[PDB]
């Protein structure tokens, strides 16, 4: 119920072989995670985790 | 009444033929998935 | 009554992303709509995402 919004403009970089597939309640295609995970978003001025 | 008459009926009664269908690469997703 | 509080129509702002956000909800609300002519989502999801 919460939403994890993006910290700053960029690129979101992760590995997917972790992540598995599946498709949601809406509709739309979209990655289950089960492990924890550390995504970045690239901005040009700083990475953010 | 069994599958297999009631196919029968569908197709010298009411016309019914598994005609094809050809779909989006995302319509098939949504067929397979679901 | 020294300091006088009172209120005026412009003194009631708003955040300053609000354009962005309602602009953004409205493109995924169309982009759903077309898809669900289409046959790519159901009823029942088209619902829920609204």
Redesign the interface.
């Known amino acids: 119920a919460e939403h994890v919004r993006a910290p700053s403009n960029g690129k979101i970089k992760f590995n997917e072989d972790l992540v598995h597939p599946t498709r949601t309640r809406h509709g739309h295609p979209a990655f289950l995670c089960s492990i924890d995970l550390y995504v970045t978003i690239e901005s040009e001025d700083i990475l953010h985790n | 009444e069994s599958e297999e008459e009631a196919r029968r009926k569908n197709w010298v009664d009411r016309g019914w033929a598994p005609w094809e269908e050809i779909?989006?690469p995302?319509?098939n997703?949504?067929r397979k998935?679901? | 009554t020294a300091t006088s509080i009172s209120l005026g129509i412009d003194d009631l702002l708003t955040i300053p992303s609000k354009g962005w956000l309602v602009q953004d909800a409205e493109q995924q609300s169309l982009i759903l709509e077309k898809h669900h002519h289409y046959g790519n989502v159901h009823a029942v999801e088209k619902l829920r995402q609204s």
């Open positions: 779909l989006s995302e319509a997703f949504a998935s679901l």
